[PDB]
Enzyme design. Structure first.
Site, PDB file in Angstrom:
ATOM      1  N   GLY A  24      11.810 -22.846   6.329  1.00  0.00           N
ATOM      2  CA  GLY A  24      13.021 -23.550   6.678  1.00  0.00           C
ATOM      3  C   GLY A  24      13.816 -22.650   7.620  1.00  0.00           C
ATOM      4  O   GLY A  24      13.452 -21.491   7.879  1.00  0.00           O
ATOM      5  N   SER A  25      14.931 -23.170   8.105  1.00  0.00           N
ATOM      6  CA  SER A  25      15.679 -22.475   9.148  1.00  0.00           C
ATOM      7  C   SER A  25      16.263 -21.137   8.632  1.00  0.00           C
ATOM      8  O   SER A  25      16.231 -20.164   9.397  1.00  0.00           O
ATOM      9  CB  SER A  25      16.786 -23.386   9.731  1.00  0.00           C
ATOM     10  OG  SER A  25      17.749 -23.682   8.758  1.00  0.00           O
ATOM     11  N   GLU A  27      14.890 -19.092   6.791  1.00  0.00           N
ATOM     12  CA  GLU A  27      13.768 -18.166   6.639  1.00  0.00           C
ATOM     13  C   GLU A  27      13.155 -17.705   7.945  1.00  0.00           C
ATOM     14  O   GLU A  27      12.372 -16.713   7.984  1.00  0.00           O
ATOM     15  CB  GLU A  27      12.695 -18.806   5.742  1.00  0.00           C
ATOM     16  CG  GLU A  27      13.228 -18.989   4.305  1.00  0.00           C
ATOM     17  CD  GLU A  27      14.188 -20.157   4.209  1.00  0.00           C
ATOM     18  OE1 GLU A  27      13.931 -21.196   4.908  1.00  0.00           O
ATOM     19  OE2 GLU A  27      15.194 -20.073   3.470  1.00  0.00           O
ATOM     20  N   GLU A  46       6.896 -26.924  -2.681  1.00  0.00           N
ATOM     21  CA  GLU A  46       7.122 -25.600  -3.285  1.00  0.00           C
ATOM     22  C   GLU A  46       6.523 -25.427  -4.662  1.00  0.00           C
ATOM     23  O   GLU A  46       6.234 -24.299  -5.097  1.00  0.00           O
ATOM     24  CB  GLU A  46       8.624 -25.290  -3.303  1.00  0.00           C
ATOM     25  CG  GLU A  46       9.198 -25.173  -1.917  1.00  0.00           C
ATOM     26  CD  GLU A  46       9.644 -26.483  -1.214  1.00  0.00           C
ATOM     27  OE1 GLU A  46       9.465 -27.635  -1.742  1.00  0.00           O
ATOM     28  OE2 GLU A  46      10.188 -26.345  -0.081  1.00  0.00           O
ATOM     29  N   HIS A  69      12.783 -22.037   0.746  1.00  0.00           N
ATOM     30  CA  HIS A  69      13.978 -22.464   1.496  1.00  0.00           C
ATOM     31  C   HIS A  69      15.168 -22.826   0.655  1.00  0.00           C
ATOM     32  O   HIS A  69      15.188 -23.851  -0.011  1.00  0.00           O
ATOM     33  CB  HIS A  69      13.632 -23.695   2.382  1.00  0.00           C
ATOM     34  CG  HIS A  69      14.791 -24.112   3.234  1.00  0.00           C
ATOM     35  ND1 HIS A  69      15.475 -25.296   3.053  1.00  0.00           N
ATOM     36  CD2 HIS A  69      15.460 -23.438   4.193  1.00  0.00           C
ATOM     37  CE1 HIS A  69      16.486 -25.353   3.905  1.00  0.00           C
ATOM     38  NE2 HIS A  69      16.495 -24.235   4.607  1.00  0.00           N
ATOM     39  N   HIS A 280       2.577 -25.620 -31.603  1.00  0.00           N
ATOM     40  CA  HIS A 280       2.843 -26.794 -30.751  1.00  0.00           C
ATOM     41  C   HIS A 280       3.202 -27.960 -31.631  1.00  0.00           C
ATOM     42  O   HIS A 280       4.388 -28.346 -31.770  1.00  0.00           O
ATOM     43  CB  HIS A 280       1.618 -27.001 -29.874  1.00  0.00           C
ATOM     44  CG  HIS A 280       1.675 -28.163 -28.943  1.00  0.00           C
ATOM     45  ND1 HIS A 280       0.936 -28.185 -27.782  1.00  0.00           N
ATOM     46  CD2 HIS A 280       2.353 -29.329 -28.975  1.00  0.00           C
ATOM     47  CE1 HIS A 280       1.142 -29.321 -27.142  1.00  0.00           C
ATOM     48  NE2 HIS A 280       1.978 -30.044 -27.857  1.00  0.00           N
ATOM     49  N   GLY A 400       2.419 -25.117 -20.475  1.00  0.00           N
ATOM     50  CA  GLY A 400       1.996 -26.514 -20.450  1.00  0.00           C
ATOM     51  C   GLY A 400       2.577 -27.368 -19.327  1.00  0.00           C
ATOM     52  O   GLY A 400       2.443 -28.587 -19.368  1.00  0.00           O
TER      53      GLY A 400
HETATM   54  C1  LIG Z   1       5.529 -31.382 -15.523  1.00  0.00           C
HETATM   55  C2  LIG Z   1       5.089 -32.099 -16.771  1.00  0.00           C
HETATM   56  N1  LIG Z   1       5.426 -33.409 -16.945  1.00  0.00           N
HETATM   57  C3  LIG Z   1       4.987 -34.077 -18.040  1.00  0.00           C
HETATM   58  C4  LIG Z   1       4.230 -33.427 -19.001  1.00  0.00           C
HETATM   59  C5  LIG Z   1       3.767 -34.164 -20.246  1.00  0.00           C
HETATM   60  N2  LIG Z   1       2.292 -34.300 -20.396  1.00  0.00           N
HETATM   61  C6  LIG Z   1       1.574 -33.590 -21.302  1.00  0.00           C
HETATM   62  S1  LIG Z   1      -0.151 -34.009 -21.394  1.00  0.00           S
HETATM   63  C7  LIG Z   1       0.142 -35.248 -20.208  1.00  0.00           C
HETATM   64  C8  LIG Z   1      -1.008 -36.123 -19.742  1.00  0.00           C
HETATM   65  C9  LIG Z   1      -1.878 -35.470 -18.702  1.00  0.00           C
HETATM   66  O1  LIG Z   1      -2.856 -36.457 -18.357  1.00  0.00           O
HETATM   67  P1  LIG Z   1      -4.218 -35.999 -17.669  1.00  0.00           P
HETATM   68  O2  LIG Z   1      -4.004 -34.768 -16.797  1.00  0.00           O
HETATM   69  O3  LIG Z   1      -4.646 -37.262 -16.958  1.00  0.00           O
HETATM   70  O4  LIG Z   1      -5.165 -35.586 -18.897  1.00  0.00           O
HETATM   71  P2  LIG Z   1      -5.691 -36.489 -20.152  1.00  0.00           P
HETATM   72  O5  LIG Z   1      -4.618 -36.250 -21.209  1.00  0.00           O
HETATM   73  O6  LIG Z   1      -5.781 -37.909 -19.651  1.00  0.00           O
HETATM   74  O7  LIG Z   1      -6.969 -35.803 -20.589  1.00  0.00           O
HETATM   75  C10 LIG Z   1       1.555 -35.296 -19.785  1.00  0.00           C
HETATM   76  C11 LIG Z   1       2.106 -36.246 -18.772  1.00  0.00           C
HETATM   77  C12 LIG Z   1       3.957 -31.999 -18.829  1.00  0.00           C
HETATM   78  N3  LIG Z   1       3.266 -31.279 -19.722  1.00  0.00           N
HETATM   79  N4  LIG Z   1       4.359 -31.426 -17.658  1.00  0.00           N
HETATM   80  C1  LIG Z   2      12.388 -28.861   0.100  1.00  0.00           C
HETATM   81  C2  LIG Z   2      12.558 -28.361   1.493  1.00  0.00           C
HETATM   82  N1  LIG Z   2      11.667 -27.453   1.940  1.00  0.00           N
HETATM   83  C3  LIG Z   2      11.740 -26.998   3.243  1.00  0.00           C
HETATM   84  C4  LIG Z   2      12.775 -27.461   4.048  1.00  0.00           C
HETATM   85  C5  LIG Z   2      12.955 -26.971   5.457  1.00  0.00           C
HETATM   86  N2  LIG Z   2      12.798 -28.014   6.513  1.00  0.00           N
HETATM   87  C6  LIG Z   2      13.855 -28.444   7.286  1.00  0.00           C
HETATM   88  S1  LIG Z   2      13.449 -29.649   8.532  1.00  0.00           S
HETATM   89  C7  LIG Z   2      11.777 -29.382   8.127  1.00  0.00           C
HETATM   90  C8  LIG Z   2      10.700 -30.130   8.909  1.00  0.00           C
HETATM   91  C9  LIG Z   2      10.553 -31.601   8.514  1.00  0.00           C
HETATM   92  O1  LIG Z   2       9.420 -32.105   9.254  1.00  0.00           O
HETATM   93  P1  LIG Z   2       9.212 -33.700   9.392  1.00  0.00           P
HETATM   94  O2  LIG Z   2       9.684 -34.445   8.166  1.00  0.00           O
HETATM   95  O3  LIG Z   2       7.759 -33.850   9.841  1.00  0.00           O
HETATM   96  O4  LIG Z   2      10.229 -34.111  10.575  1.00  0.00           O
HETATM   97  P2  LIG Z   2      10.296 -33.611  12.157  1.00  0.00           P
HETATM   98  O5  LIG Z   2      11.190 -32.374  12.088  1.00  0.00           O
HETATM   99  O6  LIG Z   2       8.894 -33.236  12.566  1.00  0.00           O
HETATM  100  O7  LIG Z   2      10.979 -34.757  12.877  1.00  0.00           O
HETATM  101  C10 LIG Z   2      11.579 -28.448   7.020  1.00  0.00           C
HETATM  102  C11 LIG Z   2      10.225 -28.086   6.461  1.00  0.00           C
HETATM  103  C12 LIG Z   2      13.778 -28.381   3.471  1.00  0.00           C
HETATM  104  N3  LIG Z   2      14.813 -28.827   4.165  1.00  0.00           N
HETATM  105  N4  LIG Z   2      13.586 -28.866   2.204  1.00  0.00           N
END
Ligand SMILES: Cc1ncc(C[n+]2csc(CCOP(=O)(O)OP(=O)(O)O)c2C)c(N)n1
Ligand SMILES: Cc1ncc(C[n+]2csc(CCOP(=O)(O)OP(=O)(O)O)c2C)c(N)n1
Ligand code: NA
Ligand code: NA
Lengths: 525, 524
Positions: A24-25, A27, A46, A69, A280, A400
């Site tokens: 980003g800008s 950085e 990210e 960023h 758990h 997890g």
């Molecule tokens: C960021 C995040 N969001 C939600 C959960 C809740 N979560 C735990 S197991 C699971 C299911 C994952 O499904 P998959 O990867 O398809 O494996 P499966 O259980 O079908 O074998 C979820 C959504 C988590 N652990 N982390």
């Molecule tokens: C979460 C996040 N990560 C990184 C940035 C830094 N950022 C600012 S403008 C930009 C480029 C966006 O590119 P695009 O959507 O393709 O539009 P364009 O500039 O090519 O018109 C980035 C990565 C941000 N603003 N938010």
């Protein structure tokens, strides 16, 4: 000399020459003049940046540098930090800030109260009070992340700092060494020896810091010296022991009552390199069997403090085990006998069974493959069926937090180009870190990405059935075509519907030097 | 009655009957018995969950309810909270926690020090000290989010709380009203009137809270009353004025020296519903022209306190504007004249220019379309070329956090099913919120997703030039096929390489009732 030149000199001498980022800008003034001996690994989101860095730091056994960023970039990475915390991952997270004069007025891209943002998921965070302190603050960051207990840190840097002159005295920083003295005293070693040698029937329990400290072989020596079984501590994130060694017993259940049942015949439990314990499921009962004592060896004072039971020793795991193996007597109790091999499962005539997929992987994969696992209903079957003989062979999200798998596979494969990384990822889990496919394509990092596609959040459906809950929304994930998504991000993709088709796809992927996505429709009940 | 029954009663009576979520085990006891009159909108990643809720809250003008999983789910949504903060979005964010007896030992799925996690991006954060306080804490969360200045709040709930009996006295909560008195006093109103009426050459500057408060028509009335031009405040996230009204002057540059140059001829600047000011690029110089005074009307005490210049009045914008319009005397100065239209850009025959794409949008889109924009190098061209006549017609991430666009388009379209939502998204920005396509497909939410594909992070190439940086890594995004990605998530997808192919794709998408992804390769 500038803050910029002094900072890259510090990174180079400390060995942080791979930068994982999304730019980003704020950085751009850091990334200016990026050195030819450094490498930049772009992620498109990210969460994937941080998870790649995590895999890299863990597999390399070195700190990893991240550049994000401002507040929105830091924020998008915060789920990935939960896993990095419990894996003791030494990540140096930097984020760029607005010019100093524009922070208080809250200009666009000002990260307000920046040091508070990543808390409580970092061990240290700062925004230096002046440009001149930036090089020392970056040194502090690196040495805080890489001291036991290792973990992520955060530094917010106003973008106008980099071009300023470096201060007098900056030349002392780049060469600094910080060493950790963690050997037991003579009395502490005697206590461990006396208690272990006096036990009728001791047992060994091993966590992710056994793998992190490269103590796997020592753990095998310890188990053999006392003729005792070895388990993995619950909620396993790494594999600390060879899984077909005759003392191996698998992963403990993540339940209070379950562990006291599994370990009921043992009078002494020795836990190394894990918390006591990452329970758990809710399963009230006894923390320990009646008359059983617990010994805990850990690198983390907070693990030692928070345990509900046992006597802890906090220090250097590999030096402690080496001393213990030397000081213990031999034992002439009989050797533990191996677990029986897993039987093939019954053919049912529907979609492929995960057990079948795993039997094929165990047959065709190299014996020093590295597995990155984020498929939540298939963990038990994987540990039963896929041999892991060498250290550094398994990674599963330690908090997890899903979205670890695809990115961590790319980071691990980058750290260990001489081994082959196979990701075993659910259809649900894939979508939290999906853009890692692109980074693998762009940099030709040859992960074999296996997507088990059962159509549901299977582990949640299981848990819901257990609570007799039938009315919960949001548990199904129909209508996903991972071959189309893989090709979209530039990865060669194939669908494998039968055991023979899966074998051919895995063989061909392993023979090649490009990333491949293998979509496997699977049975779920 | 249980903590569960009392909590859904509160949500129902307060109007929070759509739940945006991604589930987990700590949340299953909450989701148990989900009522038939509630709606659950599943997102596949929490950044998308929060962005959908954000769009829904802003476009509906009501608070939105979110359910996330523990610390990892909360964490994944935190980039989206940056935008929700600066757009004053009333989001009630709940996250499920481990059983109370397993939190301190740090069991798997325990959210440690939970109230600290989303800070500083929430206006209030809590984990109730006991199950019996969960219903009152939920009420507190709702009324904190929805009072001026509106914004996101956070509640962490141990999963064993839901089944516990509701406490005595819980019945008072669901019916509670919290109203905000925000009219100016007689003296406050007279001061604004006296100053504005005495000015030689006043100007109006409008931010996102003009749209949020539904004050667009009053802002036009005010401009006309004082015969003055009207600009949008810098770093615009909403559209507060009809963009072909003859007093409209566009969006101010996000630059200290730029604003004082643009506004040089005005002796009095009246800023309504924006901070003073969301500068972006570093362009030092005069905060104000010599001799100029600034008046500021805001709903946010923090905006009022942090401004480097001006006299501020903090209160209810729509009520304040109506009082002012009523009180101002007649003015005989001539009306401002309209800005000239944009010139065509000459097609060089190869890849499409964004300006050409925007001209086609302006020709074919309904005159009350809603635009959700996250295309960072094309903002000026968009505002020059695409007319926005009606309120609630524009959404751009208020913190500049990318990943807002695809999810917010989906949430806006859910809030306003009678209007058609057109997402204008870059190839870079799409990837931060890409799974929103799936939710559109699953719920048949008929967004037109337009992906401008230039191969690069275009705005970062601009800033690299400005900052005099020529060797930065990571600025290019080659090797993306959005037709394949769209189809992978279930959305009908088409590539449009020429002006005619784009017109045909946009016309067909608008005539149907399914989401569509239109991939448009563009020049930088
Ligand atoms: C960021 C995040 N969001 C939600 C959960 C809740 N979560 C735990 S197991 C699971 C299911 C994952 O499904 P998959 O990867 O398809 O494996 P499966 O259980 O079908 O074998 C979820 C959504 C988590 N652990 N982390
Ligand atoms: C979460 C996040 N990560 C990184 C940035 C830094 N950022 C600012 S403008 C930009 C480029 C966006 O590119 P695009 O959507 O393709 O539009 P364009 O500039 O090519 O018109 C980035 C990565 C941000 N603003 N938010
Ligand atoms: Na699944
Ligand atoms: Na772009």
């Amino acid at each position: 000399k500038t803050v910029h030149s002094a900072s890259y000199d510090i990174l180079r001498q400390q060995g942080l020459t791979t930068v994982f980022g999304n730019p980003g800008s704020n950085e751009l003034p850091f990334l200016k003049g990026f050195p030819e001996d450094f490498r930049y690994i772009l992620g498109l989101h990210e969460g994937a940046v941080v998870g790649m860095a995590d895999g890299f730091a863990l597999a390399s056994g070195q700190p990893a540098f991240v550049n994000l960023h401002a507040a929105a970039g830091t924020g998008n990475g915060m789920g990935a930090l939960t896993n990095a915390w419990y894996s003791h991952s030494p990540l140096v997270i930097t984020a760029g800030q607005q010019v100093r004069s524009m922070i208080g007025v809250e200009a666009m891209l000002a990260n307000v109260d920046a040091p508070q943002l990543p808390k409580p998921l970092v061990k240290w965070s700062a925004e230096p009070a002046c440009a001149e302190d930036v090089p020392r603050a970056l040194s502090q960051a690196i040495h805080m992340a890489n001291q036991a207990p290792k973990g992520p840190v955060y530094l917010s840097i106003p973008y106008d700092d980099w071009a300023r002159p470096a201060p007098a005295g900056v030349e002392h920083l780049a060469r600094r060494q910080v060493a950790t003295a963690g050997l037991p005293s003579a009395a502490q070693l005697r206590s461990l020896v006396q208690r272990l040698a006096a036990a009728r029937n001791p047992v060994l329990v091993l966590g992710p810091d056994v793998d992190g400290s490269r103590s796997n072989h020592l753990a095998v020596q310890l188990a053999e010296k006392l003729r005792m079984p070895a388990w993995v501590a619950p909620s396993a994130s790494r594999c600390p022991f060879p899984t077909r060694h005759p003392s191996f017993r698998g992963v403990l259940p993540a339940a209070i009552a379950g562990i006291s049942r599994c370990l009921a015949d043992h009078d002494l439990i020795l836990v190394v390199g894990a918390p006591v314990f990452r329970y758990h499921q809710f399963a009230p009962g006894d923390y320990l069997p009646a008359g059983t004592e617990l010994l805990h060896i850990t690198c983390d004072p907070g693990e030692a403090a928070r345990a509900p039971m046992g006597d802890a020793l906090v220090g250097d795991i590999v030096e402690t085990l080496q001393a213990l193996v030397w000081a213990l007597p031999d034992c002439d109790r009989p050797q533990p006998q191996a677990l029986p091999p897993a039987a093939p499962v019954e053919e049912l005539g529907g979609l492929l069974r995960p057990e079948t997929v795993f039997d094929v992987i165990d047959e065709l994969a190299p014996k020093d493959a590295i597995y990155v696992k984020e498929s939540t209903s298939t963990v038990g079957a994987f540990w039963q069926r896929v041999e892991m003989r060498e250290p550094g062979s398994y990674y599963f999200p330690a908090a997890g937090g899903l979205g670890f798998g695809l990115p961590a596979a790319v980071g691990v494969q980058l750290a260990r180009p001489e081994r082959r990384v196979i990701g075993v990822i659910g259809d649900g889990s894939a979508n939290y870190g999906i853009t890692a496919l692109w980074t693998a394509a762009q940099y030709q990092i040859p992960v074999v990405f296996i997507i088990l596609k059962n159509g549901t959040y299977g582990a949640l459906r299981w848990f819901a059935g257990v609570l007799q809950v039938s009315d919960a929304p949001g548990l199904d994930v129909p209508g996903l075509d991972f071959c189309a998504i893989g090709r979209g991000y530039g990865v060669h993709s194939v669908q494998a519907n039968t055991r023979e088709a899966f074998a051919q796809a895995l063989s061909e992927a392993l023979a090649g030097d490009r990333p491949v996505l293998i979509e496997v429709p699977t049975l779920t009940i």
